């Protein structure tokens, strides 16, 4: 009974985290697609905390020297 409850607690923690994490990841993907729909070649799309944006765009223009289209 202790091994059952130990394994069921470890399992249900894993399943709650996995389903809640996947739910957040798909919610982030919904918002990403809604904005990205407005627009070899290559591109990426993603999510970041809003206060990081000024340093983030500056660093992108440093590594991809003087040349990044972004929104």
């Amino acid at each position: 009974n202790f091994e059952k409850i130990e394994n069921e607690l470890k399992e249900i923690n894993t399943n709650q985290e996995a389903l809640k994490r996947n739910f957040l990841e798909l919610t982030e993907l919904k918002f990403i697609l809604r904005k990205t729909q407005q627009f070899r070649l290559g591109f990426v799309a993603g999510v970041i905390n809003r206060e990081r944006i000024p340093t983030f765009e500056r660093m992108l223009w440093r590594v991809c020297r003087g040349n990044v289209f972004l929104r």
Partner: protein, 57 residues
């Protein structure tokens, strides 16, 4: 604003696909032409060797 980026990305795909595909088609044509022109030059060299041999014969 955003329409110039849309046009750049749609043109990027079009150019990068089409220019490469036309060059791939040209590569096949040039290779076929190599065989055809090589054979035509071989036939002219054969015709010369035959005309030369007739002058001996």
């Amino acid at each position: 604003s955003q329409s110039q980026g849309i046009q750049q990305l749609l043109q990027a795909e079009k150019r990068a696909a089409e220019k490469v595909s036309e060059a791939r088609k040209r590569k096949n044509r040039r290779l076929k032409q190599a065989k055809e022109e090589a054979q035509a030059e071989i036939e002219q060299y054969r015709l010369q060797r035959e005309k030369e041999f007739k002058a001996k014969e």
